[PDB]
Amino acid sequence: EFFESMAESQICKPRLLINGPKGNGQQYVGAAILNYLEEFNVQNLDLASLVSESSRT
Amino acid sequence: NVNFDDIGGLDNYIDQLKEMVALPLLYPELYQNFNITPPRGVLFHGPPGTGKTLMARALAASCSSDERKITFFMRKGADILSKWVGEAERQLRLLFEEAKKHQPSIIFFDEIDGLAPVRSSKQEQIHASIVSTLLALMDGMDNRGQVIVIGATNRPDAVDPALRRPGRFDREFYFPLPDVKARFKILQIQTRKWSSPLSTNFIDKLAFLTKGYGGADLRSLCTEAALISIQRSFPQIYRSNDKLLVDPSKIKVKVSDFMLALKKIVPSSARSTGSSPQPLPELIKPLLADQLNNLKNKLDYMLNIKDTTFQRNTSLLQNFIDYEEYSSFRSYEFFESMAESQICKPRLLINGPKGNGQQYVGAAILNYLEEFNVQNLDLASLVSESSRTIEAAVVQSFMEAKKRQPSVVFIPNLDIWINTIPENVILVLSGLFRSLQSNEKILLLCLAENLDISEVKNGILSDFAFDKNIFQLHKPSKENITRYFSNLIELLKTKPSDIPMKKRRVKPLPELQKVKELILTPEQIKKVSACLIEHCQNFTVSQLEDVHSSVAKIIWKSKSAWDKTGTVDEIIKFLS
Amino acid sequence: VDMNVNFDDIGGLDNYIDQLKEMVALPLLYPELYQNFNITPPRGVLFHGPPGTGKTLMARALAASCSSDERKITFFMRKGADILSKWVGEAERQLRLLFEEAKKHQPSIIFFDEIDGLAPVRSSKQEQIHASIVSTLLALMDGMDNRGQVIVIGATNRPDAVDPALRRPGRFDREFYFPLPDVKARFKILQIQTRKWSSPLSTNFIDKLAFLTKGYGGADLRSLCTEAALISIQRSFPQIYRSNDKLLVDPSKIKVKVSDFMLALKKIVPSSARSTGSSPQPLPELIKPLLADQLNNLKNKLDYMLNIKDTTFQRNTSLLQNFIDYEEYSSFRSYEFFESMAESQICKPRLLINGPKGNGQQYVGAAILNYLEEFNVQNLDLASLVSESSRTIEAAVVQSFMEAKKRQPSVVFIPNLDIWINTIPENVILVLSGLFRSLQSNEKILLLCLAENLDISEVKNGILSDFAFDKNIFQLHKPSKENITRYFSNLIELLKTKPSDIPMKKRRVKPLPELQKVKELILTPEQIKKVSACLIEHCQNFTVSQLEDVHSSVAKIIWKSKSAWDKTGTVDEIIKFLS
Amino acid sequence: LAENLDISEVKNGILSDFAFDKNIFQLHKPSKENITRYFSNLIELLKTKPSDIPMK
Numbered sequence A: 001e002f003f004e005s006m007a008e009s010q011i012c013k014p015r016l017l018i019n020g021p022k023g024n025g026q027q028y029v030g031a032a033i034l035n036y037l038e039e040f041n042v043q044n045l046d047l048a049s050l051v052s053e054s055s056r057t
Numbered sequence B: 001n002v003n004f005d006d007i008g009g010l011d012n013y014i015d016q017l018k019e020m021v022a023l024p025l026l027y028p029e030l031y032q033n034f035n036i037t038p039p040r041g042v043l044f045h046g047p048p049g050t051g052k053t054l055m056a057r058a059l060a061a062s063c064s065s066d067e068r069k070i071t072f073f074m075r076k077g078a079d080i081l082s083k084w085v086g087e088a089e090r091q092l093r094l095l096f097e098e099a100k101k102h103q104p105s106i107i108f109f110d111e112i113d114g115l116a117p118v119r120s121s122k123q124e125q126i127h128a129s130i131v132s133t134l135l136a137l138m139d140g141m142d143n144r145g146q147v148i149v150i151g152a153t154n155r156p157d158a159v160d161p162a163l164r165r166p167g168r169f170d171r172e173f174y175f176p177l178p179d180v181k182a183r184f185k186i187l188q189i190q191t192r193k194w195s196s197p198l199s200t201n202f203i204d205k206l207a208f209l210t211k212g213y214g215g216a217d218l219r220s221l222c223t224e225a226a227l228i229s230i231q232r233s234f235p236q237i238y239r240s241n242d243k244l245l246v247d248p249s250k251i252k253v254k255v256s257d258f259m260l261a262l263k264k265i266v267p268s269s270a271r272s273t274g275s276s277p278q279p280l281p282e283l284i285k286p287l288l289a290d291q292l293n294n295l296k297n298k299l300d301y302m303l304n305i306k307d308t309t310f311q312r313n314t315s316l317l318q319n320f321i322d323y324e325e326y327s328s329f330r331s332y333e334f335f336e337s338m339a340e341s342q343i344c345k346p347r348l349l350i351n352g353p354k355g356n357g358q359q360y361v362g363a364a365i366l367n368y369l370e371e372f373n374v375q376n377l378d379l380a381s382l383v384s385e386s387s388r389t390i391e392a393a394v395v396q397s398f399m400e401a402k403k404r405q406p407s408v409v410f411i412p413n414l415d416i417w418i419n420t421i422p423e424n425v426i427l428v429l430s431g432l433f434r435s436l437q438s439n440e441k442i443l444l445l446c447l448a449e450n451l452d453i454s455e456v457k458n459g460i461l462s463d464f465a466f467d468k469n470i471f472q473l474h475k476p477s478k479e480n481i482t483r484y485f486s487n488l489i490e491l492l493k494t495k496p497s498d499i500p501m502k503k504r505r506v507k508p509l510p511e512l513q514k515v516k517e518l519i520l521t522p523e524q525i526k527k528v529s530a531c532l533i534e535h536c537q538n539f540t541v542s543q544l545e546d547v548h549s550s551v552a553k554i555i556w557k558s559k560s561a562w563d564k565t566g567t568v569d570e571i572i573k574f575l576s
Numbered sequence C: 001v002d003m004n005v006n007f008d009d010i011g012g013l014d015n016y017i018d019q020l021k022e023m024v025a026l027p028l029l030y031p032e033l034y035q036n037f038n039i040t041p042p043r044g045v046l047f048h049g050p051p052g053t054g055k056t057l058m059a060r061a062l063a064a065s066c067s068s069d070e071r072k073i074t075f076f077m078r079k080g081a082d083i084l085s086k087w088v089g090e091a092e093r094q095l096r097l098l099f100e101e102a103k104k105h106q107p108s109i110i111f112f113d114e115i116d117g118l119a120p121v122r123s124s125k126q127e128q129i130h131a132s133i134v135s136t137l138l139a140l141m142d143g144m145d146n147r148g149q150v151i152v153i154g155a156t157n158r159p160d161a162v163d164p165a166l167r168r169p170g171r172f173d174r175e176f177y178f179p180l181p182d183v184k185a186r187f188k189i190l191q192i193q194t195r196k197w198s199s200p201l202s203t204n205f206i207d208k209l210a211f212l213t214k215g216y217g218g219a220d221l222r223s224l225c226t227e228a229a230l231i232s233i234q235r236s237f238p239q240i241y242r243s244n245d246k247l248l249v250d251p252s253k254i255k256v257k258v259s260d261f262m263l264a265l266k267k268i269v270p271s272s273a274r275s276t277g278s279s280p281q282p283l284p285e286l287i288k289p290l291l292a293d294q295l296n297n298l299k300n301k302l303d304y305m306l307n308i309k310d311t312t313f314q315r316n317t318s319l320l321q322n323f324i325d326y327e328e329y330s331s332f333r334s335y336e337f338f339e340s341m342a343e344s345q346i347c348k349p350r351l352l353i354n355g356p357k358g359n360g361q362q363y364v365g366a367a368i369l370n371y372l373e374e375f376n377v378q379n380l381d382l383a384s385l386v387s388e389s390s391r392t393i394e395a396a397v398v399q400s401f402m403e404a405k406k407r408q409p410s411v412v413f414i415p416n417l418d419i420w421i422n423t424i425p426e427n428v429i430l431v432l433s434g435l436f437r438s439l440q441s442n443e444k445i446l447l448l449c450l451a452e453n454l455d456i457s458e459v460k461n462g463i464l465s466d467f468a469f470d471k472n473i474f475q476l477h478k479p480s481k482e483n484i485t486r487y488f489s490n491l492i493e494l495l496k497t498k499p500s501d502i503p504m505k506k507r508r509v510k511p512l513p514e515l516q517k518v519k520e521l522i523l524t525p526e527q528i529k530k531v532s533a534c535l536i537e538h539c540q541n542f543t544v545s546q547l548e549d550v551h552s553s554v555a556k557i558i559w560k561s562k563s564a565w566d567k568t569g570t571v572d573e574i575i576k577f578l579s
Numbered sequence D: 001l002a003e004n005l006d007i008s009e010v011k012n013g014i015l016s017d018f019a020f021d022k023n024i025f026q027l028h029k030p031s032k033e034n035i036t037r038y039f040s041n042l043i044e045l046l047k048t049k050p051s052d053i054p055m056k
Ligand SMILES: Nc1ncnc2c1ncn2[C@@H]1O[C@H](COP(=O)(O)OP(=O)(O)O)[C@@H](O)[C@H]1O
Pocket: B006, B007, B008, B009, B010, B047, B048, B049, B050, B051, B052, B053, B054, B055, B152, B186, B189, B214, B215, B216, B219
C-alpha cells in the first residue's frame, strides 16, 4: 500500500501544449508523438471526428 | 443452483420478496383470510453488476422448488422487439400465456429500458403499441394467476412512468453498489468453495481496497486472483508443450496476486462520469481530513444521521422479531410530526480556491452518505444521453430524488454549472426546490471552486437559500503540510534492500514428474523538510500534489543509491 | 378477470352505474320501452381517467352483474394491441372473428383495454400497420349490417390518442371520465376493501384514513389495505419469514391496528406524488396555527368567486337519484331564464396570492387545491411544461388549457409566478392570455397564481395586465404574534414531556415462541415563560420559513436531551442559541 | 377581431397589405338603452317570488 501509492503518485496532471508558428510542422509532430505513445489509448478530439456522426451531438 | 445464501446484502429485499412469492403458495390461508393479493411485480433498479438477475434466479429456484416448482422465464427488453411491425406484441402475448399455463411463474425482463422506454422520442408508433400491450398484459388486480413480473433497469426514470403504478410494478428495489460490510459478505461468498479459504483480516483488507466495486467486479477479481495463483505456483505448465505434468494443490492465494488482480480488473464504477463515491486517498488524507470531519459534523447536524433513533430503517421484520410493541393515539403523530421537524432545508455549498481538492471532498462526502439516494446533476450526467433534453433530465432527476425520500441532489463544479447550463433549467430547479415542503429530506450539495458570494446572494443561485450554509474550504495549514510531506522522507530513508525490485533467479525453474547503511544525516533530513515546507507557503492541494510528484520522481530515480547526498542536493535545487 | 365482482364492489361511481344499466341491462328486460320511440340503446362507452380509478373493475362488474338472471352476457376481453402479428393478415382477420363470435352470442360485451395502442392517431410516417386496423374496426363497429346487441367498451388513460372517427355515435357515443375518488368515495372504497376482514375497523378510523389518503386512487387504497394486512402478518407471526417449512399458525388475533396502517401509509406512494405538479394536501399540523388564520379568508374569497357553498343548480351528482328523491316543478321563462341567471354568478374567476419570500406559499397553494376537491387541477408550472421533452412550452400550455376547458370546473395553477414570468418565453404568456380572453365569462376556469414578492406594477401595466388581476390580489402577510405563540407553545409542550412518555420501542426479555411445523421532571414554569418570551422576541417580523428554521433548530436541542430529567441544560442551551 | 388595435398598424403597418381599407367595423360600448335592458332583466329576478323560483 505504501510502494504502490508512491509509484502511482508520480503522475500529477499530465498536460502538454505544443505551440509554434504557422505551418511549423505540427501535423507531423502530432503523428510522431502519437506513434511514440502507441501503447496508450488515443482519443482524438478534432473536429472531423466529432461532427462525423450525425446522431450524437 | 442459487439459493438465498449466495446473495450478499439485500436482506431487507430478501425478506420483502418472500411475502409475494414464497408465503403466498406456502400459506394460502393467511392471504385468503384478509382477501388480499400479493403485489405481483417488482422493479429492480441500480448500477450494473449489483445482483438483480441473481436476485431473480435465487428467488425463483429457492422458494420451495420441491413439489410446487416455480418456473422462470428469462427475457430481455431488446430481445422481444424485432424488425417487424407486429412481432413483438405477439411475442409478449405468447410469453404471458406461457407463464399463465405454468401458473406459479416469474417473468424476468432484464433491461426493460429497451422494451418500454419513456415517451419523449422514437416515432414510427411501434413503441406506443409495445407499451400499451405490456401495460394491458401485466394487470395485477384482476387475478391473471401467479405470474410475478420482475423488471431490471439501470435507473427507474428511464422506464415508462405508466409502468410504475400499482398493478404493474408496485415496489421498486434499489440495488446499490456494496458497502464495506456487503463487500465483505460477497467476498466470503465467492471464497467459500475454495480449498484454502482466505482469512478474515485478508477479506477485510480486500473489502477496504475494493472501493467503487460491484458484485460482478468482485467475482471477476476473485476469479482473476485464482488464475494468477495458478499461473505463479506452477508456471511450467504453460510454456511446456509436453503432456500432463500433474500437480497437486499447495496453491495459496496470497496478497501479491490479489493486488495484481486489483490493477488488472477495472470496476464498473470507473465508467460513470463525475466523482465516484470513495473515501479520501491515503496520500492526501492529512491535507483534507480535518476540514472533511467538520463537514461531516455539519452534515451530521442538518440531516440527523447519528441521532436517528426514530428512523432506523432496516428490515422491519427484524424490528418485530427482536422488539415488542409500545392517550395511546397522540404518542404516534405528535412525536412523528416533531421528528421530521428537525430537517428544515438541508443545503450545503462547499466553496474554496481553485484546485483545493474539491473532487476529493465531494467523493468523500458522498461516500459518507451511502444510505441516501444520490442524484447527480453533473454536466456529463445530463448531456450524455441524447434521448432527453437538459430540462427533462434535470426534472426527472429531481423527481426521482423526491420519490426515494432520503436523497442528495449533487451538483459538482457549480461554477461551470452556472455558465454552460442555461438559466431556464436553473430557474426550473429553483422552483422545484421552492415547492418542496420544509420537512423533506432532500439535501442540495454543491461544490464550487472560487465562486463569488454576490452570485449566491444576488445572482441566479439566490433562490436556493445558500445564505448561512456556505462552508469554506481553506488551504491546508503548515502542520498538515508537514504530515503530508512525511511520506517522501520515509521514502528517502528506506535503503535499497527494502524496495521490491526484481532479481533474476540464479537457478532455473524446477520440473515435476512425467505422469550496509544509507548515508543520510538527520541534518540533511531537517534541511529537506525545511525547504519543502518553505516552498509550499500558502499553497493549494493541487500545487502540493504537484510538488509531491516532482519530488517523488527525484527520490525514486535514485532508489538504488546508498548515498542520498546527491538526491538531497537535487531536491534542494529543484525547490529553489 | 372474468367474474366474482359485482356493482357493490364499486364505490363512488354511482352515476355511471345507472347509465350502464340503462344501456346493457334495461334494453334486455324492457324491449317495448325502447321500441316505443324507435330508438336504439347506446352501445359502446369509452372510459378514460387517471390510472387506477376502476375502469377494468367497472367493465368486469358490468359483465358479471347484468348476467345474474338467466340472460348470459359473454365477456370478450382484449388487451391493448395484442392482436397484430408480424404479417399483414391476422390483424384484421382476428378482429373480424372477434366481432362475428360476438354476434353469435348476441348479448355480449367486448372490452378493449388500453385501446389507445390498438387505434393510434394517424401520424406522418408508419401509416399502414395501424390504419389498416383502424379502418376495419370502424367498418365492423358501425357497418351497414346490424352489429347486434354487442356493447363495445373501450378503456384508456387519455382519449385524444384514440382516433376521432372512433369517438363518434354508434361506436363510442358515450365517454365516461373516471375521477380520482373524493373523501366519500375513498371512505366507501376503504370500507369495501376492509369488509371481509374478521376483525372490522371502527368507523371513525376509516374516516380518518379517508382524510389521510388524499390523492389516492382505488388501486392505491387497495394496495394500502394489502400492505396493512402484510404488516399485521409480520407483526403477529414473524417466524414464518425465517423457516422454510409451513409452520402452524391461526388466522386469529391477527387483527390490524392503527400502527400497521400508518406504516403502510409511508410504504405506499400515491399516483399524486408521481406526478410533477403540486400535490393537493391539507395544511400540516405544525404550520396550521401560522397560516390557517389567513387561509380561511382565501376560502371565503373563493366561496364568493366560485359559489361553492351555494349549490342549487348544477348539483348533478346522479341524475337518477335526483329524479328519485326530488320532484318536478312557462317553459322558457321557468328554465332558461333561471339557468342563465344562476350561471351569471361566475364572471371571471381569478386569484393572485402574493406574499414575501418564504411565507409558506407552497403550503397555501396545496391547501387551496385540497379545498377545491371537485375541481380538475391543471399545473402550468415549469416542471410540468418541460417534463415531456417531445412537447414544446407552447404546445404543453395549449394542451393544459384545452384539457381545462373540458371538465368545466377546473383550476389552471401556476405556482411560483415570479419565476414563471421570468423563465417562460414572452409569447407563451400572450398565448395563454389570448386563450383566457377567448373564454365565456360564465366559465369556471379559475386562474390561481402564487407569487413571491411580485411587483404590483407588473400586474398593473406589464405582461400580466391582460389577465385581469384587478381586485383579486390577496396579500399573504407575515404571521402575527398569536400564531407564533401557538407554534412555540406546541414546541414547549414537546419540551416539557417526561421520558416515560417519549416512545422508546422495546427490548424483549424473552424470544418469540417457536411454531409447530406441519424520577420526576424538574422544570420550573418561570423557565418555560422565559423560553417562550425569548422565542417570541427573536422571531420578530419573521416569515414562515424563518420560523420553521428556528423551530427545527430548537427541536434539535430539545430532542438531544430527550432522556435527561434535569431540563435546565436544554433550557440554557435554547436561550444561548437565541442570542 | 382585435381589441384596441391602432389603425396605424393597419393602414401603414404589418396588416396594411391585407387591404383593410374601408372594412373596419368599430364595436362601441353599449348605449344606455342596452344597459337598461340588461339590468331590467337582472332586476326581474329580484321581483320574482320565492315560491316562483325553480327550487326543486
Ligand atoms: N449481492 C451479491 N452477492 C453475491 N454475488 C453477487 C451479488 N451481486 C452480483 N453478484 C455476482 O454477479 C453475478 C450477477 O450478475 P448480474 O445479476 O447480471 O448483475 P446485474 O443484475 O446487476 O446486471 C453473479 O454471478 C454473482 O456471483
